[PDB]
Amino acid sequence: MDVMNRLILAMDLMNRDDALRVTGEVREYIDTVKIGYPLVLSEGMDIIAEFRKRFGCRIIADFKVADIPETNEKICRATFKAGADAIIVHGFPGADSVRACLNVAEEMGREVFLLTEMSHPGAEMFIQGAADEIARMGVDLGVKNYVGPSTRPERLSRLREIIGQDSFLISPGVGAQGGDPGETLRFADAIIVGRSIYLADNPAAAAAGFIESIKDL
Amino acid sequence: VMDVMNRLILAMDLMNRDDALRVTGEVREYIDTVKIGYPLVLSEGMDIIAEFRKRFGCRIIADFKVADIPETNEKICRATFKAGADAIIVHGFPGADSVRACLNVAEEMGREVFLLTEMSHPGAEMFIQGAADEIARMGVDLGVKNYVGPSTRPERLSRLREIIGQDSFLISPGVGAQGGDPGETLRFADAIIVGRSIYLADNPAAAAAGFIESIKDL
Ligand SMILES: O=c1cc(O)n([C@@H]2O[C@H](COP(=O)(O)O)[C@@H](O)[C@H]2O)c(=O)[nH]1
Ligand SMILES: O=c1cc(O)n([C@@H]2O[C@H](COP(=O)(O)O)[C@@H](O)[C@H]2O)c(=O)[nH]1
């Protein structure tokens, strides 16, 4: 995957008008938008096709898929039907649940991103202790795309070590949650940025600023 | 606790509105509580919750296995309750802050959180099972009153019931298609969740009636 400016917009605004306006304002800086449940549950899955019609951007569906294999398959099918190019899947529910997603992705053209360790404080309770093993499971399953935490660069670096330089790694927690853009890009291929752009007084200036920060990367 | 008719919750995972509405209507004399998840919601929109309420008397549990950071969890819960869900199911594995975010929204909006502890599928043994007793204990500490645990592992469901206490409410999937037994599961769970064994049946009403006959003494 080739992400313009190594910057993925996390579009978690919850109304269509604002979400479309803000995305339009920063469109020159990106070609990849992560759309999650806050927007989809507020405005419907039709929002994905609309983003493609308006912006001709890549769409990552951040649905943190975390069900049994049978249900995971249905979720992936519905999601790719809506025009998502990729979907984010939790590793914690185990290999069969990940494989179900990989199967559908193969069938419909698309990519699976495996979420290993999460960026928020609560990730330390259960996820962190499992995260290296989750990454190894991804490697065993042939997963090529991964998500790991900007807020813990040593954990992100370890994730990169496990999956190797050939795998693709994106990383949230930049800005609002405390992660640094430049440091994150030592290890990740792209950074995910939500609030620091979409809640900014001037989202365009915010996006430009991030790119300035990582300009020599 | 919610008064689940016949201790039986329909897992409505059909992916088109017409079939989902048909099947739910056919079993409505037997079931007043319907679990709606992402297969249906991502196919037909959140307004499907409204359509179910309009057509049927039914309580709606949104099985969204919420598993994000606290800030995103709050948004998901808000959107879900705005749409009319009585309750939402949240994963415990992302930790206490993520669960608390959901509880806080549920409290403000006058709705309920169900905490998913251990899962019913084989993959659950890899990571979830080893954390599940602690996830459940965490739920109790956080004041969670409603839980989900696996019919496919009676020993684990029994332990989960111990941890949460007799006063907590416990619902359990994996009955039928995944191999769990209705009666055995009701030793520990307040209600069983049944999907495919009802919604793929030639006569879903007959299938529901059959489940109820098998648990009539309970
Ligand atoms: O470990 C993780 C995985 C996520 O996808 N995300 C998500 O990435 C985004 C972060 O946005 P923000 O920059 O506003 O903190 C959100 O959409 C959120 O759900 C996260 O913050 N940490
Ligand atoms: O541990 C779990 C938690 C779930 O919510 N569920 C879910 O409960 C249902 C099971 O349906 P079924 O009876 O067809 O196997 C599905 O909606 C599924 O996603 C599960 O099977 N095991």
Which whole-number Å values give the CA distances from A144 to A57, A77, A172, B165, B203, in the listed order?
21, 20, 18, 43, 44
- Which structure tokens are listed for A57? 């951007």
Q: How far is CA B192 from the centre of its chain?
A: 9
d(CA A136, CA A116) in angstroms, rounded, equals 10
Q: Report CB contact under 8 Å: A96, B120.
A: no
**Catalytic: B54?**
no
Q: What is the 3-state secondary structure (H, E, C) of chain A?
A: CCCHHHEEEEECCCCHHHHHHHHHHHHHHCCEEEEEHHHHHHHCCHHHHHHHHHHCCEEEEEEEECCCHHHHHHHHHHHHHCCCCEEEEECCCCHHHHHHHHHHHHHHCCEEEEECCCCCHHHHCCHHHHHHHHHHHHHHHCCCEEECCCCCHHHHHHHHHHHCCCCEEEECCECCCCECHHHHCCCCCEEEECHHHHCCCCHHHHHHHHHHHCCCC
Q: Which domain holds residue A33?
A: 1-217
Which whole-number Å values give the CA distances from A43 to A63, B79, B139, B190, in the listed order?
15, 10, 31, 35
Q: Taking Cα atoms as reference points, which of B182, B187, B195 lies closest to residue B20?
A: B195
Among B65, B75, B82, B216, the active-site one is B65
d(CA B136, CA B141) in angstroms, rounded, equals 9
Phi, psi of A32 (to 5 degrees): -140, 125
How many residue pairs from chains A and B have C-beta atoms closer than 8 A?
136
Is B141 one of the annotated binding-site residues?
A: no
Unique residue bearing structure tokens 């359990």: B172
Interface with chain B: mutation pick from A34, A37, A133, highest number of B CBs within 10 Å? A37
For residue A64, give the ligand nearest its CA.
1
Interface with chain B: mutation pick from A15, A68, A90, A195, highest number of B CBs within 10 Å? A68
- Residue B57's Cβ-count burial label (10 Å; 0-12, 13-18, 19+) is exposed
Cβ pair B77, B88 in contact under 8 A: yes
Residue nearest ligand 2's atom 7 by CA: B173
- Which structure tokens are listed for B89? 């199911």
Provide the β-strand partners of residue A113: A88, A145
Backbone region of residue A178 per phi and psi (left: phi > 0; alpha: psi in -120 to 50; beta: other values): left
What is the DSSP annotation of B75-125? HHHHHHHHTT-SEEEEESTT-HHHHHHHHHHHHHHT-EEEEE-S-SSGGGG
* Number of structural domains in chain B: 1
Atom number in ligand 1 closest to CA A12: 17
Q: How far is B117 from chain A (nearest CA, A)?
A: 11
Question: Chain B residue with minimal CA distance to A94?
Answer: B123
- State the CATH number of the domain containing residue B94: 3.20.20.70
Resolution in A: 1.5
d(CA B102, CA B181) in angstroms, rounded, equals 31
Experimental technique of record: X-ray
Q: Report CB contact under 8 Å: A75, B38.
A: yes
